[PDB]
């Protein structure tokens, strides 16, 4: 069982959401975040930036080990523009999941 964090361009939210729901992904959180991921500059609201923090979105999903690769592919394809600032995806282990209203659990990896 894995957590997938994707830092993405804010306008891409809806497209990425649609791709994920269609891939059968059920639960999801977004938060507002500022970031920089610098190779050589990034454009933002018209301006050039090197090392300053720029408004992005952090999208978080928890997924079965087997689903990881296709979910990544799906995110990459939906969020890419090819311009610097497209963002990053991180994969980390999750031990356990609990639904608050039912108490229902889950353990994979």
């Amino acid at each position: 069982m894995k957590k997938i964090e994707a830092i993405i361009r804010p306008f891409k939210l809806d497209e990425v959401k649609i791709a994920l729901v269609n891939a059968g992904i059920v639960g999801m959180t977004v938060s507002e975040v500022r970031g920089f991921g610098r190779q050589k500059t990034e454009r933002y609201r018209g301006s050039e930036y090197t090392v300053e923090f720029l408004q992005k979105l952090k999208l978080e999903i928890v997924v079965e080990d087997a689903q990881v690769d296709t979910v990544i592919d799906k995110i990459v394809a939906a969020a890419r523009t090819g311009e610097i600032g497209d963002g990053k995806i991180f994969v980390s282990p999750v031990d356990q999941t609990i639904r608050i209203r039912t108490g229902e659990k889950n353990a994979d990896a």
């Binding site: 454009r43 609201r45 018209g46």
Partner: protein
């Protein structure tokens, strides 16, 4: 009784009027739309229409041909390297005078007499656009957009004025720089988080098969556009136009349009019709 039904052509426009209520539209005005009197008058009428109907038009412009004419009057010979104008100190002075002084005020003036309220800026006014030197070196004072600060123009937009922006902007030390108007338009759009960037162009849009006119691609997304460049289907001076659209879309502009400024009322045709006056490029598809 009664003769015109302008009325039901009015009533049919409703869904389009509804669709872009309050939305910001950045139009890059140039080429034939700017040369021919017929088209020029229509562009001014369309811009005024958009504002009047509740949208927020922003005009961005350059004026290569008008610059050439003045350079000629002062004994300077026009020079270009790969699309961009080679502009030395002397040339830059003229570029500034023409674009900021003559062309800008012609646009502002005409909107004013058409009944809009236009205000003309260049990048250096309120540091709307801060310039830096373009990556291409050996071409003098050709600029790239280093930053945009829209603080100066949004209250004006909120109040219903029509900003008219020439593509010249100062260095951080005060030196004027000549920036390509498409790329200025794209960056203003990005800054204003605009609904549309529209480039008035001397082409039908993007043709799928350059040898066949009917092949006009109505809608493209980013990877698709990239794929056309890589296949040489988009070539020559269409490349920087597409790049400028992509660069703008990536920053959150909802849609970019490369449309045919050679046709009267190209703007209204694009916004309020399903006529094929150009190609729309979106950041989300297909």
């Amino acid at each position: 009784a009664g003769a015109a039904d302008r009325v039901r052509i009015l009533s049919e426009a409703l869904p389009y009027l509804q669709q872009f209520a309050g939305r910001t539209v950045v139009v890059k005005y140039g080429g034939a739309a700017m040369k021919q009197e017929e088209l020029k008058e229509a562009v001014m009428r369309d811009i005024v229409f958009l504002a009047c109907v509740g949208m927020r038009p922003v005009v961005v412009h350059g004026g290569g041909p008008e610059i050439n004419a003045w350079l000629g009057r002062v004994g300077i010979e026009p020079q270009f390297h790969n699309g961009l104008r080679v502009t030395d100190a002397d040339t830059m002075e003229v570029v500034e005078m023409v674009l900021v002084g003559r062309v800008n005020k012609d646009i502002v003036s005409r909107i004013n007499t058409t009944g809009g309220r236009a205000v003309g800026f260049c990048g250096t006014d309120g540091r709307l656009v801060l310039a830096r030197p373009h990556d291409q070196e050996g071409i003098g004072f050709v600029g790239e957009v280093n930053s945009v600060n829209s603080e100066v123009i949004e209250p004006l937009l909120e109040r219903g004025y029509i900003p008219v922006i020439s593509s010249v902007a100062a260095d951080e030390n005060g030196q004027s720089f000549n920036i390509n108007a498409d790329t200025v338009a794209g960056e203003i759009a990005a800054a204003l988080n605009a609904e549309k960037l529209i480039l008035l162009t001397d082409t039908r849009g993007i043709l799928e098969d350059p040898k066949r006119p009917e092949s006009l691609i109505p809608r493209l997304n980013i990877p698709q556009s990239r794929e056309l460049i890589a296949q040489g289907i988009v070539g020559g001076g269409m490349i920087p136009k597409v790049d400028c659209c992509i660069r703008s879309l990536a920053q959150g502009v909802r849609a970019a349009h490369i449309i045919d400024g050679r046709i009267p009322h190209a703007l209204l045709l694009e916004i309020f019709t399903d006529a094929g006056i150009g190609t729309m490029i979106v950041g989300s598809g297909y």
